[PDB]
Structure formats: structure tokens, C-alpha cells
Design a protein around this ligand. Structure first.
Ligand SMILES: [Mg+2]
Ligand SMILES: [Zn+2]
Ligand SMILES: [Zn+2]
Lengths: 97, 1215, 64
RNA sequence: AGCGGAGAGGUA
DNA sequence: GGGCTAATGACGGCGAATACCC
DNA sequence: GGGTATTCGCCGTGTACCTCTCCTAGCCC
């Protein structure tokens, strides 16, 4: 199976998993190490932030591909925001300085 | 519910920051973070679908459930923004506001946090100078604290209140510990505990005093108040973070945190009502204890009482553990533009390209198809283009074939071990529903074709295509990162045809004639006028490189080796291919083609070699049957002779002469001898089976059987697999450790009974269990080895130090394991013996081989003078790429993937053998009474010397051993010169550095041997010194103690035999014998298994292991604290250059484990991602540390570029 | 990919140079002789260096 | 109408 | 049937806490 | 006083995929 645009979750803005309900294949933990062993930060940042996790980059990259221009915007994912909002609910102050 | 105009709001957040700071939370910060309080626990109202007012899912506190709408419907338009209502006040904002802000709970009674109490370094016990059980009894309403600090029950409280007359107040619960944390002044307490550490000199009291002083110093430096451990206002999670998922039929799925929140709110409301209604004190204490247990179960469930048949998760369970957020949604996330298939081998494609199904290519490159249809003008809108795509016209396939011509994709098998698991190919459009792959690629993937799946990934940015083409294409990953051998090795189908093609026989048709060139051979082979193999004399042309110098000579070879001479490049001579193409021979040929020729010609040579092997394997037509597998003729006679022998042995045992153990030992000995004789007879009757004639006279030659060709050519089983198919398989083992007495006197060709099958099942299932456990332990060791060393990158081009190591080819007393040619290749020398600071290629090691060198000073990566990594000149030569190591390539992850990869495969008299002389080093001989030579030493080294200048073997000389010869005497082979009379947990034990079972006690320092002192329950061992006193310690009385009284101990010898501890050998001499011992033991383990791993991947790990150091004098920092080498060296040079002449003190190195080095780091994000998240978060909460953001994991977690590889100039221009 | 190893010593500098070259051909620049293969051929032909890329970038910033 | 967690089986 | 209403079949390694003979 | 000797408690145990069912429940009319 294959997919390009699918459904997203509510906790973290990520695609689902499985052949049913249009779920993308999970990028493993060791695959990130195999990518970082080659270096290649541009194909590791584009396959982690603007592909799945960003709520604005996932639309901006699609708009740039359909239109024709090439100008990407890097930003923090939504999962780190969910993690810091979960840490802040434990009476532990954590601010992005 | 649905928003449309919010989708185009681009460039709303920048998120430009430098550091990450974490500290404690003030109650005013919690009161200002929230937007309201909650008082009624109700998350979903029944009989109507509306959020409950002031509940868990509320609208007046968090926000609206519908976007740009309110609850009632008074304001239901986008023109009204920021206008709240009067009956239900909801801010008419975006739907994103339900995830950012949160709520709080006003508690009438205080409650303490469980992370600062139930943790093993308890901070409250260090602050109040009390134990854990006393504060456990006090905080849970079972004792009393007066206000100096003591445990006090209720009868002591009443007898004190009867005599104090309401003048001695004592509180119980959270109020007492709150007043004790409030009323203390840490500024005077620091000086008071400084006087306490100036007075008390006990060692554990010193450790507790430095711990309390460091905690008070961190608390005063961070500015956090000690009263912030206990809390009054408890915040809650935002309602968008957890969903209320409905089920089929209008139901609702249960949750874990919502029930705990409703329980907390219910207990708080009951406690508030009991406090307002003036309840008696015992039920107020019971309600406060119940609220304390409920909050302690909410913060960390399962640590105190495990409040439920399945314990639900909490705020500490969905972060720490396997299903936590750090290992599920931070490191590895599910991405789009992906998909799996089933692999299928395809031989009609090159190694730089791969196959791809048409529907997968249409579904993956669909936005590119939309952009091409918009650019060509065949479809106006994307909806019409999508309908034309799903209608499946003929122009859609033309657009799909045109859009991906040189656009690379990524391929990745889902179980990956090393760094070559992700490669890039240029896909082509084929039919079917299976991805076609090159056969030479699957050697690196280790992917069998029994239904394996791999997931593809599509790089879609402008830079990711260049990053996948320049350094991830299959034509660039030729050499393995482990060793210098290339991964392009012909597999089981190619090397069989190449071995059938490149051999010869005695007499075939078409021999004896002279050919012109390779074209005449190809013109005479296809019309079947000559044989495939015949002793002919051909003439070939080959150039010579120094530069191109052509030359024409004559040679005598076969027809197949002459046909192989048309596909090899011109840089290779014919002498490297005239031998029969075996596995190691063709590996040496591929390495010699890659060494001194280039890359693209080696790539096209490996392309044509597989096609030649396929075209000759389809012409050979090899087949194994029941006639090709032969049995030995004397096998039945040897079996009957062994049967008569074991019958005579059993008769002599049952007659009453020999005991059962020695009879069983001699039975299995003669059965192993019979199995070896049967294997030798089977090899003799298989290898020398075929006979031929040469001019009438018969001659012997190598046989051309089906099994013998597959055995001798490689890419199959060893000689044991041929022994199990021809002769007896020997003696099988038992699971408890013993050997079965009865043998298996039948091969797989003959029939087998149930007894030997049941015996073989024991050895069959244990191998499967061992491979499963080895795979699990290999995955765990790979994860730990990745997470221990991930910051070492190539930063500079030179360090400046010239310390280096001493590289020597190690021997054990027999054949060599590795020569000097295999150990020094690819390194940088330290001093001249060959100039210094140079790179040793394959020619320089051959030039220094004949120079009779013994040990070369080589700069290794365990001694460098760089900051936050190592430099390029110290690491040496890369193993993956043949050139020098570039600036910006990480070497820790490559070394970890190289070490963790072969883990799933892993589970009296000295007679010489060489001919030469004998050398004497580290030995001392005394004159014997008979005129002979006897050596006296604690540990001797008897080494030999060959004619070339290298040592062949090295033996040991014990105390009083008599050597037959002297130094320089010529000793031949088979002579006796000695005369004296008497696993993967092992790999993990060196990385974790645990204590052994019987640790070897080493000496203190270089001192003379003294007499044994008197015992007082343990043995005392004294040592005589020159000027100082005697250093004595204890000894275990259970094991044997061998200390010589009238002798002399050298600088760091041993007194108890056994395996020594790494901490003792680090404390004794330094880091060089520890590094040599670790690399030697790991190399002996990996050579006993059979996988070669280069030494620098172990040197990087043992350099990262030795990072924390300690000091013995407090100059500017503390005393018992352990810091890194870099910061201590910087502050030492600062104090020596700016402050005074020689201000700081000397540092001493200490060793830590891999987990102990992964936990106690400088930062806190990467250390709280794999193990012990609660302890690291508790330590970072009271320290108030600031993350410097320099690593290869924390940039992945945050989301910026990593500072290794392509993203290096970004970090260079950022600072 | 094999010819570009001799003109530059660093592979990551080659990747960043081809990335800086790829941002110009998308907006429209007449080539020297897919933009990736054309940029790699322009690099391997010993025609495009770090000075000419800066010159075209300055001309684009001035003619923006 | 999209989103959740458990239990069992199977391939690599 | 109904509608709101609230177990004992894991195993190894490491750090603190009494505590017992000296 | 004091310096270890058991002893209790905390920490953890590979990756990815495919299919199926079953969940908050209960209680006196
Ligand atoms: Mg397989
Ligand atoms: Zn309203
Ligand atoms: Zn160095």
C-alpha cells in the first residue's frame, strides 16, 4: 500500500498506522541512527518535521510542491509542545529559553 | 468542529531560541498559567451533549468545543472576536487554544510531591537531615513533629501537652514539613554545615556532607525556595491532550487520568466540606491521608499502593517506560510518503536502480503528477486532475514515467542493524505488485526472499535529493564501515558459475591449440568446437600502471579464464585472476580492483561480473541428487570395528574393572576418533572420486561432483555440513551440559530412528533459543552503545598532542591472530621510526613490512586535546570511504552500529612449532645446581623470533621453570624447551564494567614483599617500602592467598590469581594498559566467534567511557564532585593564566559504566530519554540547569539541524 | 558523483554548494551546457565555483 | 463522520 | 430487562539503611 | 564509636508489519 495525504491524530499531529485507515509506515528509532551515520541533516530534518509533525509545514511543503517554488520553513513540532505542556502539569517549570 | 479560513494562516510562529531551562514551579506561576479553577468533577454531561460548567471538560476555563462558536448561540459568527457571554463565558477564539492553556485545582490542605520523596536520593531527607521512614510516618499522619526534629507518637504528645500548658506546639502532616521548609535559612545553614564538614572526618559522613553542601549550593544558585517541594495549587492537563473516544452504539471509552482527576476533585470537595462544617480531628486526618494517597497515586501510580484488575497509567507512566512519549512521539514518528511491499529479485536491472510498482509510484508521486498536469495545462483544477488520475487514462502513465527519471527514493528494511540499511536508488516503472531489487544489494541488507518486507521513503525537498544522491547512492556505499573489505561480494548463484567456469581438467576436447586473443576464444566457444575448460595457450594484451604502458605477452590458461579476461578492467593484471575463483579469491580481486583503479570502473565491473556468472550458471545446470551424494566404502567396516571395540569396553566395564565415568570418557573418546576417521574417509572418497586419462595413462584429479563443487567454492556450509550428509554426525549434546553416550551411526541419506532424532532435537531447539536471546541482547547492547557515545564528531583538523600508543601484533603461543599489516593500516603515526604525522596507505605498510619494524608509535583517539569531540588527524583513515575523514562526519554512531551489528550472530609442557631462535624479555634466570638454565620470575615472557623479524609465538615462564636452551639458540619445530611440573554477557561485562565473581587483588604500589601479619577475621598483607610506611589491607579468607615473604614485588604485580577488575587497573597505572586489555579481550572474543572488527571503533567507545574525573584537592571547585576533562582543563588553564601562577590542583581519572556515563552528563534531555526519567528529572528540577544544546539527539528532539554532516555551516554561522 | 570528488575535498561542502546552486535554477537561470543532474554536470565540468555562485546570488539580490 | 487502550495468533 | 448515577512460572545489577561484632 | 555485612528497594529486558475481538457498569423496580 502507499499514501501521501492521510488522517492525523488529536494528541500529536502525526499520521496513523496500518494498512487500514490510511496509516503511514513508522520511521524506526534505528533508522534515524542509520540516517545520522551518513550525516545528511537536510534529509533528516525534512523527514521528521515538515513531513508529518508540523501543522503548518505539512501544508507549506504541499503548497510549494504543487505551485512550484522552493522555500521551506523550519519550526518546532507539535509533539514537543505536547511534551512541554505535559511536563508543565507536573509542577515543574520548563520554558523554551 | 470544522475550520476553513484558518488553514491559510501561514508564518504564525518563529520559535527562535538558544537554550532550554528547567526549574521548580512557584505557586504564583501556576496561578498565572491557569485561567480558572474547577470544583465539580463531571467530564461529560448526560442526556445532552454540552460541556459541564466548571468541570473536567469545561468551556469557561479552557475554551469552546466548536470553532468560532459558543455554547448557547448568542455569538455564532467570526466577526465577534474576544467577546465573552454572560451565562456561559467562552472566549470566541480559535480551536487551537484548547491545547495551550490549562487549569488548576485549589486544595484546602497541602500535599507533597512524590518525585522528591519516593526517589532514592531523597531531597527532603537531605534537607531536613532525616530518614525516609520517619518522614513517611510523619507525612501520612502516624507521628508528630514539634517546632527539635524527632519522631513522636500520640501518647508522648498527650503527656507533653499535659505538662507544657499549651506552650509546646506540634503539627502533624504537610503543615509541619511546610513550616520546617519555610522557617529555615539556608545562608546560615551553609556555614553551619561547613563547620560540620570542618569538624567531622568520617568518610560516609564526609560523603553525606558534600552531598548536602552541593544540594544547598545548587538551591541558592538556582534561587528556588525550599518550600516549593510541597505544593498547594496543583495544575491539570489541557482537555485537548486526552480524547474521549466514542465507541459503536453511542458509548464512551474509559480513560486513566480523568478518573484520577475526578477522584482528586471529589476528595478535595469532601475535605473542604468537612473543614467548613468543623468535623472532629480524626476524620479530618483520615481525609487528609486519603487525599495524600490519591495525589501520590495520581503523580506516580504503582509506586506506593498500586491503586487500580489492571493498573491504569498516570503522568509518570506515559512518559517513562516503553509506551512513553520520548520513544514513541519524539525520536521515531510515523511519516507520510511511505509504503511497504514484498521484495523480489530482478537480474535485468543495474545496481544503481531498483524496481517499483506502478500503483505505488502513482500514489507516492501524486503531488508531482498534479504539478505536472497543472504545468502542461491538460487539467485546470486539482479536482479534475485527481478524477483523471483515478479514472486511469493513458496520459497519466506518461506523466508518471516522465516525472521520475533521475529522482531518487529511499529504501529501508524494517529490521536494521548497521548503517547500510538505508540506501538510495533511482526507481523505474515495472509491472506487478512487488519491488524489484538488485541481487548484490541484498548482501548488505541481509534480506532473504522468503516473504520479507521493506518500507520505502520519498525525499521531496530540494536538498534531500542531493543528500540522497551524493552520499546515499548504492554506487558510493561499496566498503563496509566495519572493515576494509567491500560488500559487493558474489553470492551463492554467481560464485558457483564462476568456480565452474575457472577450473580445468586432465583431457578435454579442443586442447593444445594456440589462440590469437579473447575474440578468437569467444568466436570458437559458441559454435561448440572447443570445450569450456581446456589447457590452451592464448595471447592477451594488458597495460601497466605506475601512467599507461601497454604490453603483449603469452600465457597458458583455460578457456573460461580467457573468457573472463574480457570483462575485467585494464588496471588488473592476469595473475590475480588465473587462480580459481573462490570466495576469498574474488574478495581479494574486488578489493584490488577498488584499491588502485577507482570507483566507476569497479562499479561497472561488478555489474558485468554478475551477468557473466548468471549467463554461465544458466549454461552449467548444476543439480544435486541421490546419486551425487556418495557414501564411503570402508564406513561399514570402521563402524563394525568400533562396535566390536565398544562391546569389548562395555564387557570390561560390566565385568568389574573400570568405573563408569572413565568408561564413558573412553567410549566418547573412541567415538570421536571414529567420527574423525569417518569424516576423513568421506572427504577422501568425495574429493578424489573422479578419475581421467591423459594420453592413455590414467591420472588423478579433483572431482566435479555436485556437493564437492558447492563445498569447495564457498557460499554454502562448511565441512561439517558435508560430514553430516555423507558420514556420521558424531556425538550430540544435552541441554544440561553433558554428552550422550550413544552416537548417530547414520547420515541424512540413510534412514533415522526416533532415538537419534530425539537426540538431535535437543541440539536443534537450543540453537533457536540461543539465537532469539542473542538477538534480544544484541538489540539492547546496540541501543546502549548508541546512547553512550553520540557527541564525538570531527571538529578540527589537528589537536597538537603527540602522545600516541604502542601498536604491537599480539600473539598467544601459536599461530598469529592478526599481523602488523592488518593493525596499523589506516592510522596516523606519532613519531618517526617513515616520517611522522602521515597517513599509512596500502603501499606504505608494504614498504615498512620489509624494514623489520616491531612497534610503531601511532596516535589513537583515546588521547586527544580537542573540545567536544576529536579531530581528523587523530582518528585516522575512514573505513567506509577510502579517502581521509572529512570535517563533520560523526564517528560515534558508526562505531556503535559496527559494534552492535554482529551481536545477533555471536552466542605443564610447551612445545614450539616454528623454526628459528628464542628471545628473552621480562625474565630472570638463576644458575642451577646441575648446570642447566632455570628461570625465576613472577611472570615471564618466552618469545621466539622468525627469519623475517616478527615474533611467531610467545609463552609464559612460571616460578622455577627450567628452560632447555639459551637466548639466540636455533630451535627447530617439534622441540621441547619447557620443563616445569604443577559470550555476549562477556562482551557486556567489559562495557558495563561490573565486578567479577572472584576478583584478582592487585598490589598497592611499587614496594618490596613483606611478611604476613596476624589475622583478626581476615588476612592482612603488608608490603615493605623504601622510605614510606607499609600499605596493608584486608584479604578474603575463603580463597587461596599466595604471598611470598622473602621476595620482591614489581610496580603493580598481582597476588591472587583470577580475572582482574578494570577499576583497579585504572587506579594502578593509567589508561593505556586498560585500553590495550579491553581492545585485546574484545578482539579475542570476536576472533573466537569469527567476525573481524577494527580497533578504532572500540577505542572511541573506551575514550567516551573515560570522561568523568575526580580531584584530590579543592582549589576552586568542590572536593568529591566529578566533572569532565574539558571543563576542568579550561578552568585549570584559566586559574593558571589569569588568577595566579599555579592556582588549581591535579585531577585523577575515574571509570564509570556505560549507563553511569549516559545518565550523569552535562545536559538533561538526552540523559532522560532511555533510562530512569524520574531520577534525572528530579535531579534537574532541584539543580536548575541550562541545556547548552550540543548533541546528536537533543537537536532531533527539539527539531533543528544536527551539528554533524550537512548541517555544520548553519551552526558555524549561528554562533 | 564520481567526477565531483576530485574538484572539492569535502563532500558536505559539495552538497551545500549544489544546494546553493539548486535554488537559482528553480526561479529560472539559463544553464551552462532535472536540475540536480545539470547542477552536478556544471560542478564536474569545472565551471561553477564559490565565487560565481556568490556573483549570481548578489545579482539576484540586487535585481529582486 | 475522523482520532484510544487491552488480549490472542502469524511472517521476517 | 432498564436509565441515569456514580496474583504466587523472572533474573541480574546497583544504591541506601540498620546493625552487629570489634 | 565504627567499618563493612547482609538486606530492601529501584532499574531494565530489540525492531517493524498483518489479522481477529472487546471494552464503565450496575441495580432495585
Ligand atoms: Mg527473511
Ligand atoms: Zn454563551
Ligand atoms: Zn587528536
Amino acid at each position: 500500500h502507499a499514501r501521501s495525504t492521510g488522517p492525523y491524530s488529536l494528541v500529536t499531529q502525526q499520521p496513523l498506522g496500518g494498512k487500514a485507515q490510511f496509516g503511514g509506515q513508522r520511521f524506526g528509532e534505528m533508522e534515524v541512527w542509520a540516517l545520522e551515520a551518513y550525516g545528511a541533516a537536510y534529509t533528516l530534518q525534512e523527514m521528521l518535521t515538515v513531513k508529518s509533525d508540523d501543522v503548518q509545514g505539512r501544508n507549506q511543503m504541499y503548497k510549494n510542491i504543487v505551485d512550484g517554488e522552493h522555500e521551506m520553513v523550519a519550526g518546532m513540532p507539535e509533539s514537543f509542545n505536547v511534551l512541554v505542556k505535559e511536563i508543565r502539569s507536573l509542577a515543574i517549570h520548563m520554558e523554551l529559553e | 468542529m470544522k475550520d476553513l479560513l484558518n488553514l491559510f494562516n501561514q508564518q504564525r510562529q518563529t520559535l527562535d531560541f538558544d537554550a532550554i531551562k528547567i526549574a521548580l514551579a512557584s505557586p504564583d506561576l501556576i496561578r498565572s498559567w491557569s485561567y480558572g479553577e474547577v470544583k465539580k468533577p463531571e467530564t461529560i454531561n448526560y442526556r445532552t451533549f454540552k460541556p459541564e460548567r466548571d468541570g473536567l471538560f469545561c468551556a469557561a476555563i479552557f475554551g469552546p468545543i466548536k470553532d468560532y462558536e459558543c455554547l448557547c448561540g448568542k455569538y455564532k459568527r467570526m466577526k465577534h472576536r474576544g467577546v465573552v457571554c454572560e451565562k456561559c463565558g467562552t472566549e470566541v477564539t480559535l480551536a487551537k487554544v484548547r491545547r495551550e492553556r490549562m487549569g488548576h485545582i485549589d486544595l484546602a490542605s497541602p500535599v507533597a510531591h512524590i518525585w522528591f520523596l519516593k526517589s532514592l536520593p531523597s531531597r527532603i531527607g537531605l534537607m531536613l537531615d532525616m530518614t525516609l521512614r520517619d518522614i513517611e510516618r510523619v507525612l501520612y499522619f502516624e507521628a508528630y513533629v514539634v517546632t527539635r526534629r524527632q519522631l513522636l507518637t500520640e501518647e508522648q504528645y498527650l503527656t507533653a501537652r499535659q505538662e507544657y500548658n499549651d506552650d509546646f506546639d506540634a503539627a502533624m502532616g504537610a503543615e509541619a514539613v511546610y513550616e520546617l521548609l519555610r522557617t529555615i535559612d539556608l545562608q546560615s545553614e551553609m556555614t553551619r554545615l561547613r563547620e560540620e564538614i570542618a569538624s567531622t572526618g568520617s568518610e560516609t559522613k564526609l560523603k553525606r556532607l558534600t552531598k548536602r553542601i552541593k544540594l544547598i549550593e545548587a538551591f541558592l544558585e538556582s534561587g528556588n525556595r525550599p518550600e516549593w517541594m510541597v505544593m498547594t495549587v496543583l495544575p491539570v492537563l489541557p482537555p485537548d491532550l486526552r480524547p474521549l473516544v466514542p465507541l459503536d452504539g453511542g458509548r464512551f471509552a474509559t480513560s486513566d487520568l480523568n478518573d484520577l482527576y475526578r477522584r482528586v476533585i471529589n476528595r478535595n470537595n469532601r475535605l473542604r466540606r468537612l473543614l467548613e462544617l468543623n468535623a472532629p480531628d480524626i476524620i479530618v486526618r483520615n481525609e487528609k491521608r486519603m487525599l495524600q494517597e490519591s495525589v501520590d497515586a495520581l503523580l506516580d501510580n504503582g509506586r506506593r499502593g498500586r491503586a487500580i484488575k489492571r493498573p491504569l497509567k498516570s503522568l509518570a507512566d506515559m512518559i517513562k517506560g516503553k509506551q512513553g512519549r520520548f520513544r514513541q512521539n519524539l525520536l521515531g514518528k510515523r511519516v507520510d510518503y511511505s509504503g511497504r511491499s514484498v521484495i523480489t529479485v530482478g537480474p535485468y536491472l543495474k545496481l544503481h536502480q531498483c524496481g517499483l510498482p506502478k500503483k505505488m509510484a502513482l500514489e507516492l508521486f501524486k503531488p508531482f503528477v498534479f504539478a505536472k498536469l497543472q504545468r502542461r495545462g491538460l487539467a485546470t483544477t486539482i479536482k479534475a486532475a485527481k478524477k483523471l488520475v483515478e479514472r486511469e487514462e493513458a496520459e497519466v502513465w506518461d506523466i508518471l514515467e516522465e516525472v521520475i527519471r533521475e529522482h531518487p527514493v529511499l529504501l529501508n528494511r524494517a529490521p536494521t542493524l548497521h548503517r547500510l540499511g538505508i540506501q538510495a536508488f533511482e526507481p523505474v516503472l515495472i509491472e506487478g505488485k512487488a519491488i524489484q531489487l538488485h541481487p548484490l544489494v541484498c548482501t548488505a541488507f541481509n534480506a532473504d526472499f522468503d516473504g520479507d518486507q521493506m518500507a520505502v521513503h520519498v525525499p521531496l525537498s530540494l536538498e534531500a535529493q542531493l543528500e540522497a544522491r551524493a552520499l546515499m547512492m548504492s554506487t558510493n556505499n561499496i566498503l563496509s564501515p566495519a572493515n576494509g573489505e567491500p560488500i559487493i561480494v558474489p553470492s551463492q548463484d554467481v560464485v558457483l558459475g564462476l568456480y565452474y567456469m575457472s577450473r580445468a581438467l586432465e583431457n578435454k576436447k579442443g586442447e593444445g591449440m594456440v589462440f590469437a586473443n579473447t575474440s578468437e576464444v569467444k568466436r570458437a566457444y559458441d559454435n561448440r568446437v572447443v570445450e569450456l575448460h581446456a589447457k590452451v595457450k592464448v595471447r592477451i594484451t594488458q597495460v601497466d600502471v605506475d601512467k599507461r604502458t601497454s604490453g603483449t605477452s603469452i600465457v597458458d590458461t583455460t578457456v573460461g579464464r580467457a573468457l573472463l579476461s574480457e570483462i575485467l578492467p585494464e588496471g588488473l593484471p592476469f595473475q590475480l585472476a588465473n587462480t580459481e575463483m573462490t570466495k576469498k579469491n574474488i574478495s581479494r580481486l574486488i578489493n584490488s580492483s577498488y584499491r588502485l583503479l577507482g570507483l566507476k570502473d569497479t562499479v561497472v565491473f561488478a555489474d558485468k561480473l554478475m551477468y557473466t556468472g548468471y549467463a554461465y550458471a544458466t549454461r552449467a545446470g548444476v543439480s544435486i541428487g541421490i546419486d551425487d551424494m556418495l557414501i564411503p566404502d570402508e564406513k561399514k567396516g570402521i563402524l563394525t570395528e568400533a562396535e566390536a571395540e565398544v562391546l569389548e569396553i562395555q564387557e570390561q566395564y560390566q565385568s568389574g574393572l573400570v568405573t563408569a565415568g572413565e568408561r564413558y570418557n573412553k567410549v566418547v573418546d573412541i567415538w570421536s576418533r571414529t567420527s574423525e576417521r569417518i569424516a576423513k574417509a568421506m572427504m577422501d572418497t568425495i574429493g578424489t572420486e573422479k578419475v581421467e586419462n591423459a594420453k592413455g595413462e590414467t591420472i588423478d584429479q579433483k572431482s566435479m561432483n555436485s556437493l564437492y563443487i558447492m563445498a569447495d567454492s564457498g557460499a554454502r556450509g562448511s565441512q561439517a555440513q558435508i560430514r553430516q550428509l555423507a558420514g556420521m554426525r558424531g556425538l550430540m549434546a544435552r541441554p544440561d551440559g553433558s554428552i550422550i553416550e550413544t552416537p548417530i551411526k547414520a547420515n541424512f541419506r540413510e534412514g533415522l530412528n526416533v532415538q537419534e532424532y530425539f537426540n538431535s532435537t535437543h541440539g536443534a531447539r537450543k540453537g533457536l533459543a540461543d539465537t532469539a536471546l542473542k538477538t534480544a541482547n544484541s538489540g539492547y547492547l546496540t541501543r546502549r552503545l548508541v546512547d553512550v557515545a553520540q557527541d564525538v564528531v570531527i571538529t578540527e583538523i589537528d589537536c597538537g598532542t603527540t602522545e600516541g600508543l604502542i601498536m604491537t601484533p599480539i600473539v598467544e603461543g601459536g599461530d598469529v591472530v592478526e599481523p602488523l599489516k592488518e593493525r596499523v593500516l589506516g592510522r596516523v603515526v606519532a613519531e618517526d621510526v617513515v616520517t611522522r604525522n602521515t597517513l599509512l596507505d596500502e603501499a606504505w605498510v608494504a614498504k615498512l613490512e620489509d624494514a623489520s619494524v616491531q612497534s610503531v608509535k601511532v596516535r589513537s583517539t583515546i588521547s586527544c586535546e580537542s573540545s567536544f569531540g576529536v579531530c581528523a588527524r587523530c582518528y585516522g583513515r575512514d573505513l567506509a570511504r577510502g579517502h581521509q575523514v572529512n570535517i563533520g562526519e560523526a564517528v560515534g554512531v558508526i562505531a556503535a552500529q559496527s559494534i552492535g551489528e554482529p551481536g545477533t550472530q555471536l552466542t605443564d609442557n610447551i612445545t614450539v612449532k616454528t623454526t628459528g631462535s628464542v628471545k628473552f624479555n621480562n625474565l630472570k634466570s638463576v644458575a642451577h645446581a646441575s648446570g642447566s638454565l632455570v628461570a625465576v620470575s613472577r611472570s615471564g615472557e618466552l618469545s621466539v623470533l622468525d627469519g623475517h623479524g616478527r615474533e611467531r609465538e610467545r609463552y609464559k615462564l612460571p616460578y622455577g621453570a627450567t628452560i632447555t636452551a639459551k637466548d639466540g639458540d636455533a630451535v627447530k619445530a617439534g622441540q621441547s624447551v619447557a620443563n616445569w611440573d604443577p559470550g555476549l554477557p562477556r562482551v557486556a561485562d567489559l562495557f558495563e564494567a561490573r565486578k567479577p565473581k572472584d576478583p584478582a587483588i592487585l598490589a598497592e604500589r611499587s614496594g618490596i614483599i613483606s611478611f604476613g601479619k596476624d589475622t583478626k577475621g581476615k588476612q592482612r598483607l603488608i608490603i615493605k617500602d623504601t622510605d614510606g610506611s607499609e600499605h596493608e589491607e584486608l584479604i578474603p579468607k575463603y580463597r587461596q592467598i599466595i604471598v611470598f615473604e622473602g621476595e620482591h614485588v614489581t610496580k603493580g604485580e598481582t597476588v591472587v590469581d583470577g580475572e582482574p577488575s578494570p577499576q583497579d587497573i585504572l587506579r594502578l597505572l593509567g589508561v593505556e594498559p586498560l585500553a590495550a586489555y579491553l581492545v585485546k579481550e574484545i578482539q579475542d572474543v570476536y576472533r573466537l566467534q569469527g567476525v573481524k572488527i577494527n580497533d578504532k571503533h572500540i577505542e572511541v567507545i573506551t575514550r567516551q567511557m573515560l570522561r568523568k574525573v575526580e580531584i584530590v584537592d579543592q582549589g576552586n571547585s568542590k572536593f568529591l564532585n566529578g566533572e569532565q576533562v574539558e571543563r576542568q582543563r579550561v578552568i585549570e588553564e584559566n586559574a593558571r593564566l589569569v588568577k595566579r601562577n599555579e592556582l588549581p590542583a591535579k585531577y585523577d581519572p575515574v571509570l564509570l559504566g556505560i549507563t553511569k556515563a549516559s545518565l550523569a552528563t552535562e545536559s538533561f534531555i538526552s540523559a532522560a530519554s532511555f533510562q530512569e526519567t524520574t531520577r534525572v528529572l528530579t535531579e534537574a528540577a532541584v539543580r536548575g540547569t541550562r541545556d547548552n544544546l550540543r548533541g546528536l539527539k537533543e537537536n532531533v528532539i527539539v527539531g533543528r539541524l544536527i551539528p554533524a554532516g550537512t548541517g555544520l555551516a548553519y551552526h558555524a554561522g549561528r554562533r | 558523483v564520481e567526477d565531483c570528488l576530485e574538484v572539492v575535498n569535502n563532500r558536505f561542502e559539495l552538497v551545500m554548494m549544489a544546494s546553493k546552486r539548486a535554488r537559482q535554477l528553480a526561479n529560472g537561470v539559463q544553464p551552462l551546457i532535472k536540475p540536480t543532474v545539470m547542477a552536478l554536470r556544471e560542478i564536474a565540468a569545472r565551471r561553477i565555483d564559490n565565487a560565481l555562485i556568490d556573483e549570481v546570488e548578489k545579482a539576484e539580490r540586487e535585481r529582486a
